[PDB]
Design a protein around this ligand. Structure first.
Ligand SMILES: CC(C)=CCc1c(O)ccc(-c2coc3cc(O)cc(O)c3c2=O)c1O
Ligand SMILES: CC(C)=CCc1c(O)ccc(-c2coc3cc(O)cc(O)c3c2=O)c1O
Ligand SMILES: [Mg+2]
Ligand SMILES: [Mg+2]
Ligand SMILES: [Zn+2]
Ligand SMILES: [Zn+2]
Lengths: 323, 316
């Protein structure tokens, strides 16, 4: 079983990794084994003098703080977003663009970006007067919480994977991670996409053909959109993965809708199991959210993402054909 | 003693209220007695159907969560910002609904609650629990909001129990928008927007919520930075208090080997030069813009600010 797991982890650089199989083969430790594999692939333990036992202890603790009883926003989603960000970071149009610290920030942000997610939306937490929404003044409630947990767990015994970074490196990494995870708030999607469109329309490339990013605002904006694309990448994956992600998010959404209905609240979009069209919802999700984002990402890195975009468009056509 | 306190509160509508005397005469309850007076002066208990006992219970609880061992950011500052906002809201030239007035006054009352007497940058650079919770972003102001709202859930403390569901949602949003705007790192952006509004000012007039909340943000920020515009005897007491708080923070930064924050190094301080710099660079640019917005209602306030700057300069 460990032999089979190792073989599957050889696909870590590939879009369409069998992430559900890795979750089973690893004993429900996909985030740990995929993060460890990616850290070895990018030589990050050596570069940042991360002790391997510290990395594993932190990863196992972080993975524990994802909820195993939440169908979608769990450790498998986290591992998937990590691995997708890892592939997006390797795209030819970004070669040598980001520093090792920025690469570390983007992967770490992906790993923590949904930790301790309760399986209900920001708006649900706000409208139910939740302790989380009270703590965070109704503002990026979940995302502030994911950050606070992800950073707090570094203080647990033998968990500070950043123990050998300089103070300035720790300070910079912390700021970048915060900027990245806060941008995964779905209420920010339209503004993030608008700014990404502006960057594509005005983009510049070096003599070597890679994206020219010469200030923090532009660099962090690319990393924000990269992780947001990774978070919204399920419809760009091979259909058998996409359908499993859709089954999971619909379970989570329907359970939220059941709580909304019981409370006499308006039921959130896609959360009403008695008035649901999952197929129509997917076509609309792709048409209005996912394809506008991924088409713009594909333009930024053209032609690197053409196959991802082709898969997204095929999946849209497939779902449309079931209507 | 309880008879002198009543006469002091008769000037609740005046710039330069004797808030330190009121703090003393009320047994260190200036926030509770001044908020009550202002709510009674504005028949807010009747307009929003607030039980008097519920108001007093909340107010005492809120006042209790200001720290008595913090020389500046305590319940006297809270009472003073409340009362200053109350006066600025009565500016003839101002147009806000009664829910907007309520949000501005409530926001003023809670805007520094549970302040530990150190700055956001201090909390960030020391890896505090507060900065860990709030991801280094408006750390104090997010905390003040969360405490102020949480206290409404204590027994007999929900002063908004008789607002409609929509009113509570609207009030909550405005209070958050206002208190977050009191973060001093946002001063330049806030002032830039106040200037833009002044250049486009229409009067008989703020038609969109964006403009109105910006005025309320700048109004409470003005009230928060109103000490140098008060009568000199008041301003000097506020200066003595914040210098004590700053110097205690700078002692902690020195001991930790951190860079000492501006005005916090007691061994290289010039309180007087700091006051002229504070007025020239922060307070007077802000108040000159506010006075342009409300022309000419703020003339006496700006006059006092300019007199106080002249006096501090003469002490150098
Ligand atoms: C308001 C609105 C229309 C949507 C905003 C919104 C959220 O706030 C949160 C999560 C999603 C989402 C995420 O991952 C999916 C994966 C699938 O495989 C299928 C899916 O449908 C989805 C989703 O919907 C979402 O779309
Ligand atoms: C420079 C800047 C943009 C912000 C720095 C900054 C803070 O962060 C926080 C509080 C103050 C401040 C407040 O109330 C005062 C009252 C006085 O009577 C005398 C005073 O000196 C001050 C102050 O200094 C401040 O200036
Ligand atoms: Mg999320
Ligand atoms: Mg404050
Ligand atoms: Zn996510
Ligand atoms: Zn204040």
């Amino acid at each position: 079983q460990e032999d089979v797991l190792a073989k599957e982890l050889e696909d870590v650089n590939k879009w369409g990794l069998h992430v559900f199989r890795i979750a089973e083969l690893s004993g429900n430790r996909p985030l740990t084994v995929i993060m460890h594999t990616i850290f070895q692939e990018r030589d990050l333990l050596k570069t940042f003098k991360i002790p391997v036992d510290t990395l594993i202890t932190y990863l196992m603790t972080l993975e524990d703080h994802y909820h195993a009883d939440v169908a979608y926003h769990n450790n498998i989603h986290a591992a998937d977003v990590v691995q997708s960000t890892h592939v997006l970071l390797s795209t030819p149009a970004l070669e040598a663009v980001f520093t090792d610290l920025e690469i570390l920030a983007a992967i770490f942000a992906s790993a923590i970006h949904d930790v301790d997610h309760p399986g209900v939306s920001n708006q649900f937490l706000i409208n139910t007067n939740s302790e989380l929404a009270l703590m965070y003044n109704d503002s990026s409630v979940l995302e502030n919480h994911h950050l606070a947990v992800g950073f707090k767990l570094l203080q647990e015994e033998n968990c500070d994977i950043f123990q050998n970074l300089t103070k300035k490196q720790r300070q910079s990494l912390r700021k970048m991670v915060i900027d990245i995870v806060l941008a995964t708030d779905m209420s920010k999607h339209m503004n993030l996409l608008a700014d990404l469109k502006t960057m594509v329309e005005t983009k510049k490339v070096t003599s070597s053909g890679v994206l020219l990013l010469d200030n923090y605002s532009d660099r962090i904006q690319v990393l924000q959109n990269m992780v947001h694309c990774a978070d919204l990448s399920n419809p760009t994956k091979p259909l058998q993965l996409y359908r499993q992600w859709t089954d999971r998010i619909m379970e989570e959404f329907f359970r939220q809708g059941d709580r909304e209905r019981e409370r006499g609240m308006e039921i959130s979009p896609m959360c009403d199991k008695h008035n649901a069209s999952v197929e129509k919802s997917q076509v609309g999700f792709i048409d209005y959210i996912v394809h506008p984002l991924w088409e713009t990402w594909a333009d930024l890195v053209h032609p690197d993402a053409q196959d991802i975009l082709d898969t997204l468009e095929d999946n849209r056509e497939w779902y449309q054909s079931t209507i």
